[PDB]
C-alpha cells in the first residue's frame with residue numbers, strides 16, 4: 001500500500017510526507033496542486049514516442065556539419081546479428097523512409113545506447129547523427145523491437161482591498177538555545193529585492209532569550225500588500241552585522257492574509273544577493289538554531305483581477321533606457337518615464353524587465369493598472385522567443401505571478417532540445433518563485449514528464465539540491481515527487497538502480513578518503529572494496545547519470561585508481577552492459593568529495609549555452625564540457641574524458657617537478673600522439689579552436705586565470721579546463737608559450753595558425769556579445785543560486801566589463817586582442833607563480 005511512498009522517499013532523498021518543519025500547509029497544498037498537471041501530461045503523452053524518446057532538433061544543420069557531407073550522403077551501418085550492410089541515405093530521409101529502403105514493425109536503435117532513430121523528422125535532425133558528423137564517426141544502428149509502453153505504465157489513483165489599516169506585526173522576541181553585546185530585529189516588507197517598508201525594534205542586550213513585545217506598525221496599508229510580499233525578519237548585533245534571517249509570505253497560497261502566532265526557526269550567515277535569503281523555508285535544525293516569535297492579527301482574502309504619443313527627446317531617452325543591459329540600474333527618473341509611457345514601453349518586449357521594475361508594487365491601484373497592462377500584451381505574445389529576456393523575468397527581481405507567468409508562457413514554445421540547454425538554470429530559477437506551486441514548477445513538471453531525457457536530468461538536478469539545500473529541499477522534493485509519480489514504472493526502476501549504485505560508490509569514495517593522511521600504499525583496500533561491491537550487491541547494469549543513453553555494467557577493478565591528491569577522488573571504469581556496443585571502451589566515472597560540484601554543473605552548462613550560441617554563427621570551438629552531476633553534500637561524479645592528460649604533466653615529463661617550463665613540449669607531445677601528418681595538423685587545428693574557445697569562455701566568466709595542472713588536452717588536440725569549483729598580479733586567460741608554439745609562434749612573432757586563433761577568438765567573443773543580455777542574466781543567476789561566496793553587486797557586475805557593454809564591435813575587438821597581448825607580455829610569470837604558490 002504505502003510501500004510505494006517508501007520507494008519514492010528513498011528516490012527523492014527527503015520525506016515529503018513529513019510535516020515537522022512547516023507552519024502552514026503550502027507544501028501539501030502543492031502536492032495536491034500538481035496532481036492535475038501530472039495526470040494531464042501523463043494522459044496526453046504519446047506512449048510509444050515516450051518509450052523511445054527520440055532526441056531531435058529543429059535547428060538548421062550548421063555549416064561545419066554540412067561541409068562534412070558527401071552530397072546528400074550519410075552512411076548508416078545497420079546491424080542484424082553477424083554482418084552489417086551500409087546504406088546511402090539523404091539528410092532529409094525520415095527513419096521510416098530508411099526502414100522501407102532497408103526492407104528492399106521494427107525500429108532503429110543506436111549501437112550500445114538507449115537511443116532510437118525514430119519519428120517524423122529527417123535524420124539530419126537527430127542529435128546522435130549530428131554528434132557522429134561532428135567527431136567524424138560512422139552511424140551504427142540495430143534493427144530492434146520497440147520497447148513496450150507497458151513498461152512506462154503509471155500506477156493510478158473580508159476583502160483585503162476594503163481594509164485601510166496600516167499593516168503591523170508584533171515581535172514577541174527571539175530565543176537561541178546557545179549563543180557579548182546588543183542585538184535588534186529588522187522587519188522588512190519585501191517584493192523581489194525591493195524593500196517596500198521597513199521597521200526596527202529597539203536594541204536589547206543579546207541574551208539567550210530576548211523579549212520586546214512590540215507592535216511594529218508599517219507605513220504600508222493591508223490593501224496595499226501585493227501577492228508574493230515577504231515579511232523578511234532579520235537579526236543584527238552591535239558597526240551592525242547580519243546574523244540571522246527568516247521570511248514569511250504575508251499573503252498565502254489561497255490568497256488569504258497571513259494570521260496568527262508563528263515561531264520561525266532562522267538561518268544563520270557565513271562569516272549580498274544569495275537565493276537562499278529569499279526562501280520561505282525555515283531551518284529544520286530546531287535544536288541549535290535561533291528562532292523568532294511573532295503575532296499577526298486583524299479572515300482577509302485578496303481579490304483576483306492611456307494614449308501612446310510623445311516628444312522626440314523623450315522617445316530617445318526612453319529608447320536609450322530600453323537598450324541598456326539588465327544590470328544597468330534604473331534611476332527614479334528612468335522608472336518614472338517608463339511608467340508614464342507604460343503603453344509605448346509595452347510595444348517593446350525588451351522594455352519588459354525594466355518596465356515591470358518601474359512598478360510601485362506597494363500601491364494597489366498601480367498594481368491594478370499593471371495588470372490591465374498585461375491584458376494588452378499582444379506584442380509580447382506575438383514576439384519571437386527571447387530566452388535572455390524571458391530568463392530576466394524569472395529572476396529575483398520579479399515576485400509577481402502574472403509578470404512571471406508571461407515568461408513561462410514564452411518558455412512553452414521551446415522545443416525539447418532547448419529545454420535541455422536551459423534546464424539546470426530553469427530549475428535553479430524555481431528558487432526565485434515566491435510560492436512552491438508556480439507556472440515554472442509546473443512547466444518543468446510537464447516538460448519532464450513529456451520526455452524521458454528532460455525527465456532524467458530533471459530528476460538529478462532537483463535531487464542535487466534536495467540532497468544539500470535545507471533552504472529549498474522541501475520545495476524541490478515536492479516537485480520531484482510530482483515527477484516520479486508520472487514518469488512510469490520503467491523509469492522508477494531505472495532511477496532506483498542509479499541511486500543504489502551512486503550510494504554504494506560514494507561510500508567507497510568517502511571511506512578510501514578516510515584512510516589517507518600524498519601517496520597510497522593502500523590502493524589495496526580500494527580494490528578490495530570494489531571486489532566486495534561487485535559480488536552480489538552492485539547490479540548487473542545501471543544508467544550513467546550524466547549520459548542516460550549509456551548503461552554501465554561490470555566494474556574494471558584493475559583500471560580503478562585513487563588520485564595522489566588532497567581530496568583522493570576515485571577513478572572508476574565500467575564495462576558497457578550493452579552487448580551491441582561496437583566500441584571496446586569502458587565507461588569512465590570519477591567520484592570526488594571535497595568540491596561543490598554544483599558550481600561545476602553551472603559553469604559546464606553555461607559552456608554548452610556558449611557552444612549553442614556559436615552554432616548560430618556556424619562556429620564550432622570544440623569545447624569539451626564533460627558530464628558532471630552533483631549528487632550530495634560536497635560530493636558528485638565527473639565524466640572521465642578518455643585519452644587525455646593535464647598540461648602540467650606534459651611539462652613534468654620533459655622537465656620534472658620544477659617550473660623550467662619549455663615552450664616546445666606540448667607540440668612535441670602532440671606530434672608524438674598523432675600517428676600521421678593527416679592527424680597532426682588536424683590535432684593542431686582542433687587545438688587552435690579549443691584554445692580559442694576556452695580563452696573566450698573563461699574570460700567572459702572570469703575564471704580564465706588558471707593553474708595549468710587544471711587544464712587538460714586530448715591526444716587529438718582538444719584542450720579543455722577542469723576543476724571549475726577550485727575557484728600579486730594576474731592574467732586574462734591561459735595562452736602560454738607552450739600553446740603559442742603549437743600555433744607556430746614564439747615570444748614576439750605571428751604565424752598562419754596564430755592569426756587564425758585571433759580571427760577565431762574575435763568572432764567567438766563578438767558572437768557571445770550578440771547575446772550580452774542572455775549571458776549577463778545566466779551569469780547573475782549562476783552566482784546567486786550556485787556561489788554563496790561570490791554574490792555582491794561587484795561580483796555580478798564583472799561580466800558587464802568582460803563583455804564590453806556599450807562599446808562598438810570594433811572597439812571590442814581591440815579589447816580582446818589586448819587581452820591576448822597581456823598573455824604574450826606575461827609568458828610563464830603567472831604559471832610560474834602558480835607553481836611557487838601551489839607547491840610552496
Ligand SMILES: C[C@H](Nc1ncnc(N)c1C#N)c1nc2ccc(F)cc2c(C(=O)N2CCNCC2)c1-c1ccccc1
Pocket residue numbers: 561562563564569570571590626638639640641642644645646649722723
Ligand atoms: C586530472 C585528471 N582529471 C580528469 N581526467 C579525465 N577526465 C576528466 N573529466 C577529468 C576531470 N576533471 C585526473 N583525475 C583523476 C581522478 C581520480 C583519480 F584517481 C586519478 C585521476 C587522475 C590521474 O592522476 N591518473 C593517473 C594517470 N592515469 C589517469 C588517472 C587524473 C589525471 C589524469 C591524467 C593526467 C593527470 C592526472
